[PDB]
Amino acid sequence: MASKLRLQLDAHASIHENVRRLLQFTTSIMEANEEGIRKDIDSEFLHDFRVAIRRSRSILRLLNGVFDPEKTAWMLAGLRELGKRTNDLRDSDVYLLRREEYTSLLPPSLRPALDPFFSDLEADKRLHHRQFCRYLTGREYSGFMTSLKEFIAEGELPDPETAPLAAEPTGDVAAKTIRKALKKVLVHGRRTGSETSDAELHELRIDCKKLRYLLEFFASLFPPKATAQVLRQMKTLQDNLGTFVDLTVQMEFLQSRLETIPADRGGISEAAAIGGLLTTLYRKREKVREHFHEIFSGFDSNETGELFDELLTGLA
Amino acid sequence: MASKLRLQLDAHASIHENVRRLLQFTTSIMEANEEGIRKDIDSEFLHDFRVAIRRSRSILRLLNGVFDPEKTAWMLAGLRELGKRTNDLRDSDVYLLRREEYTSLLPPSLRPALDPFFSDLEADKRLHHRQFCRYLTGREYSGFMTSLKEFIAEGELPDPETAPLAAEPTGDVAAKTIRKALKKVLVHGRRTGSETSDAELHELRIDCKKLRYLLEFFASLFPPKATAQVLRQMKTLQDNLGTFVDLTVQMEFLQSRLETIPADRGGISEAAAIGGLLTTLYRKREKVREHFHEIFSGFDSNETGELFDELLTGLA
Amino acid sequence: MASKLRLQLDAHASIHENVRRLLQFTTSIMEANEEGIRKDIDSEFLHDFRVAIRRSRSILRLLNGVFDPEKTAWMLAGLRELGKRTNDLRDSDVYLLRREEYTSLLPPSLRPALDPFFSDLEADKRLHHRQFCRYLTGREYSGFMTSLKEFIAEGELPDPETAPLAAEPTGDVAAKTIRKALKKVLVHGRRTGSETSDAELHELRIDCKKLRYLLEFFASLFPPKATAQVLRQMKTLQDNLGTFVDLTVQMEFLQSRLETIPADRGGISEAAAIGGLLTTLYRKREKVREHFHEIFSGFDSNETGELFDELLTGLA
Amino acid sequence: MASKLRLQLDAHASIHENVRRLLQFTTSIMEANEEGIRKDIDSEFLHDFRVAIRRSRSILRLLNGVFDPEKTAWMLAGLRELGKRTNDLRDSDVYLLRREEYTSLLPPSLRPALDPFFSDLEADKRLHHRQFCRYLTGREYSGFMTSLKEFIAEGELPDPETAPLAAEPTGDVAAKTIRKALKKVLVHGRRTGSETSDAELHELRIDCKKLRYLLEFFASLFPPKATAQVLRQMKTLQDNLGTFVDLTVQMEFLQSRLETIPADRGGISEAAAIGGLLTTLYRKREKVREHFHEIFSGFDSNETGELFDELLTGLA
C-alpha cells in the first residue's frame, strides 16, 4: 500500500513544497508499517517500508537541488542506513516465501536436502526480526524519524544559492526531469547492441525505475488517461528488466550461500540442491535476456514518443 | 483497490449484518470505478469493478441462506448479467496489454501478421467501451444498483424459516464455511491422481478461490498473523492453479479467434501467428501442470492443518 | 559397424543353423574390435563390442530353446560377465565425451568446478583401460571365446527333447517371436495409463528393443521395403523411450558421483555443478515423458498393424 | 554407409591418384544405392547417394587444381545438377519421417490439421520418386556416370601448368589443406562476437564440414588414434552448428509451405499448425544459438591446437 497511492499536487506550487509533501507521505507509510513489522504479521509490512525508503531516496537524488546539500546528504544517508538495516530480514522473508517454488524445481532426490536450508533461513528470520525490532524501538531510530519529520514540516524555502531548484514551479521540474529520464532510457537501450550485458540491463532497469517513480510522483499534474497510457507503454519492458535482475539477485543470493555451506557430507547434498536452483534460474534468465531486444525495440517506437509529448503538453 | 481492502467485522454480530456490510463495500467499489471506466483512463477500473462483482457473487453462493431465496437469486442474476456485460470489453483490454509479450514469443517472420490482429482488437475495444458506457449511463443499470443498495441497507433480519443462516453469529458461520472450503480443497486435490486433468485443475482453482475469499472476508475476526500465515501457505498452490487456468483461458480465446479469421491470404499469415502463440502457451501450460502434484503435496501438510486450527481456535 | 550389418538367412534352414550364424557374426565383431580397444583408438570400438554382446544375449533369451539349457546358460553367463567387465571403461568414455555438452549447460560460476571432475574421469579411464586390456589379453577371455566359437561351429542339431526349438524352420520362429514381441509392446503401452511411471517406460524401452532386434536379425526373410517400413514406424517411439532412459541413466550416474564427492570445500563446488546437471537433465526428461502418450498413441495405429501383417504374410 | 567408410591411401602417391580413388569410391556408392532408390526401400538410400555427391563436390572444391579446370567445372556442374535433382524427393522423405515428432509438439486442437499436410507430402513423394526414377533410368544420367567413371579411371597425370596440384605428394596437400581449414574455423569463430548471426553460424558450419571431410578423406595417412581424437574434439561444436542450421532449414521449409497453403477455411487450420511448428522450432533454435559461444570457446583451446600438431607431425 505504498506504490499504489498517489498524492494530489498543485502544479503551480514550488517543487520544494511538493517534494516535502512526498516525504511526509513516504515517512507516514514507514511509520504506519512499524507495528506490522514488530508483530511479524506478514512480509508485506517490511516490503512497503522498504518501497517507501527506496522511492524517497530515488526522488531525492533525481531532484537534487530542491534541498540544501547538507540536508540532502543527511536524508539520503539516514534512509540508506535504514534500508540496509532491513536487508537481512527482507532476504529471509523472500526466500522462505520461495520455498515451495524452489522445491518444485528440483528432482525428488534433491528436494530433502533443502529442508535444513529452509530451517536455517527460519532461524535467521527470527534473529534478524529481533535485531530489527530492537532497532525500531530504539532512540537512534526514533531520533532520526523525529528530526526528519520536523525538517520536512519546515515550509520556508531554502537559500536559492545552495538549493537552486527549490523555488522552481513543480510543472517545470516535472517536464524537465521526465524528459531527461526518458531520454536516458532510450539512449541506453539503443546503445545496447547484441552483447546485451548484465551491466547494461542492470542499468536500464534502474533507468526505467527512475522514469516510473517520476511519473507516479507527478501523476496528478497530468490528465489521468495520459499518465496511465505512458505507464502501460513501459510495462512489458519493465517486466523484462525486472525479471532479469530479480533472477540475477536470486542467483547472487544462492551463490553466496554456497560459499558458506558446511564442507562436510550434509553440505554436499545441500550444495547439489543449491546448484540445481542456480542452474535452473540461470537458464530462465537467459531466456528473459533473449527477449530484451524485441521488447525494447517495441518500446522505442513513435507511439511512445507521441504519448510522452501528449503527457507533457503545455509545460516548460 | 478491491481485493486489497478488508472490512472491520464484529464476530458477535449476525452474519446477515456482516454480509450486508460486505455488499455495501463491494457495491461502493463498483460505483467508485464507473467514472474511470467511462473516461477509459486505464484497464484497472474495469478489473476492480469485475473483482467486486465476482467476490460478491461467490460469497453470496458460499453463504446461501443469509438472505431469502428470491432476493439471493435476484442479486446473483443481476450481478451475473452485469459481469457478463463486461466480458468483451475486458478481453479487448487484456489481450491489447499482452501485445508486446505475444509479439516477442514469435519468430520475426510471423510478428508482422499480428499487427492487423491488434488493430482489430483496438477497434473492438472502442466498440465495447461505447456499448458499456451506454449501459452504465442507462436507467436499467441505475435502477438495479439503486434497488441493490436499498436492499442491503435494510437491516431487519429476514424470515428465519426462509433465510435460516441470517441470524447466526458471524464467528460460527466463518468457522463452518472455512473448514468446509478447506476440506473441499484437500479432498479434491487428493483425488487428483496422476491424470491431473484440465477439469480437476479448473475445479480446484475455484475451490481455492472460495477458500481465499472466505479468509479475506472474515480476516478481521482472527489474529492478523494467523490469517496472513494461512494466506501465505496457500499462495504457491493458488499461483500454480491460476497460471494453469489463465493459460487455458488465453488458449481458448486464441482458438476462438482462429475460428473467425478470414479464409483468405492475409488470414493465413495471421493464423500462423495465432497458432504459434497457441502452441507456445500450450507448452508453457504443460510445464505448469507438471509442477502441480509436488506443489499440492507441499500444501497438503501437517503445518497447513495446524495453521487452520490456530486460525479457528475458540470458535464453533 | 555392428548394429548396421545384416545377415543373409535362409528362411527354410533350421533356426538352430541361423542363430549359430548370428553368433558367428556377433563374435566376429567382438574379436574385430579388440585391437581398437587395446590401442584406445576411439570409443566406438568398445561400443560396437558391447552392442554385439547385448544383441547376442537378447536374442539368446528371446529364442530360448534353440540350444540346450546348459549351453544357453553358459553363453548368457559368459557374455553377461564380459559385458559387465566393460561397464566402468564405457562410462568413463561416455561422460568424457559429454564434457563440453555438460559444461555448456551450467552457469559460468559453476563451470570451473567440473574441471577436477573430468580430470578424475580421465584417470578412471586410464585405470579401466589398463584393467580391461589385461583381461582381453588373458587366458580366461581367450578360453571363453575359443570355446564359444567352437560350440557355435558345431552344426549338429541338439537333442530336440532338451532344445525343442532348434529344428524349427526359421520362418516359423521369426513369425511367432515377432508377433509375440509386437503384442508385448502394444499391451504394455496401452497399460500405461496417465501415471507414465519410470518402471513402465524402462520396460517398454526393452520391449521395443527386443522387437527391433528380432526384425534386424530376421530382416533378410522379408521384402526389404516391408522390414524398412516397420522399423521406420517404430522409430519415433523408440527415440522417445531411448532418450527417457538415457537421461535416467545419466542422472543415476551423476547421483552416484554425488555420493562419493569429498566432504570438503572443493567438493562443495563440484556438488553444486553436479546438482545443476542433475536438475537440468531431470527437467529435460520430464518434457520427454510429457510426449510419450501422444507418440505411443500414434504408434498404436491401424497402419502399424497392417505393416506387420504385410511383413509376416505367408508365414506360420 | 557412405560417411562411415574410409579409403586406404598411400601418403607418397600423388594427390591426383588419391583423389581419383576417392571419386571411384563415391561414384561406386552412388551406383550401389540406385536400386534401393528405385525400389523405394528406405529413405537411407537417397541419403547416402546425396552424401556421396556432397563429399565429392566439397573435396573437389577444396582441392581445386588436382584436375584441369574444365574437367573440374564439368564434374562439379554435373554433380550439382544431380544433387539438385534429388532435393524435392529428399524433402518429402525427411518431413514424412518427422510426422510423429511434429504432431507431438502441437496442442491437441491443432494436430488434426496436419493430416492433410502429410497426405500431400506423401503425394509429393510418389510424384518425385517417379520423376527421379525416370531420371535414373535415363540415358542422360547413364551417360554422365559413364563419362565420369571413365575420366576418373584415366591415371595419366594432367598438364601441370593447368592442374598445378595434381603431381603433389598426398601428405603435403593433406597437411596444407587441413591446416588451412582449421585456421578458417578458428578465425571465423573468433570473429563471431556477441551478435552470433545466422550468416556467421551458417558459414562456420560449412567451415567445420570442410575440415571434417578433409580429415575423413586423409584419415589413413595418420595414426588412427590421432585422427579419431581430432574428430572427437570437433564433435560438440559440429553438433551445435548442425542443429542450428538444421532447425533453420526446417523453418525455411515450413515458411515456404505457408506461402502456398490454400487461402480458405481448411488452409487456416493448417496454417495455425504450421505456425505452431515454426514457432517451436524457432524457440529451440534460439536455445542452441545461446550455447554456441561457450561450445566454440571450449573448442578454441590449447589442447585442440596440440592435437592437430600431433596429427600433422612429420609432414610438410
Numbering used by the authors:
A (entry chain A), B (entry chain A), C (entry chain A), D (entry chain A): 207 to 522
Provide the authors' own sentences about this structure as they appear in the paper.
Here, we report that bacterial, archaeal, and eukaryotic conserved histidine α-helical (CHAD) domains are specific polyP-binding modules. All CHAD domains fold into two 4-helix bundles with up-down-up-down topology. Analysis of the surface charge distribution in the different CHAD domains revealed a highly basic central cavity, which is surrounded by two basic surface patches on each side. The basic amino acids contributing to these surface patches are highly conserved among different CHAD proteins.
We next compared the refined structures of the plant CHAD domain to the bacterial CtCHAD and ygiF structures. Notably, helices α4/α5 and α10/α11 are protruding the bundle cores in the RcCHAD and CtCHAD structures, forming a small pore in the center of the domain, which we find to be absent in our ygiF structure. This rationalizes the presence of “long” (∼300 amino acids, e.g., RcCHAD and CtCHAD) and “short” (∼200 amino acids, e.g., ygiF and SsCHAD) CHAD domains. Analytical size-exclusion chromatography experiments indicated that the different CHAD proteins adopt different oligomeric states in solution, with ygiF and SsCHAD behaving as monomers, whereas unliganded CtCHAD form dimers in solution (see the Discussion section). In line with this, size-exclusion chromatography coupled to right-angle light scattering (SEC-RALS) revealed the presence of CtCHAD dimers and tetramers in the absence of polyP. Addition of a long-chain polyP shifted CtCHAD into tetrameric and higher oligomeric states. It is of note that CtCHAD also shows a crystal packing consistent with a dimer or tetramer, which would enable cooperative binding of several CHAD domains to a single polyP chain. The sensograms of CtCHAD and ygiF binding to polyP could only be explained using a heterogeneous analyte model. We speculate that different oligomeric states observed with the CHAD domains used in this study may account for this behavior. However, heparin, which is absent in bacteria and plants, was bound by CtCHAD with binding constants comparable to those determined for polyP.
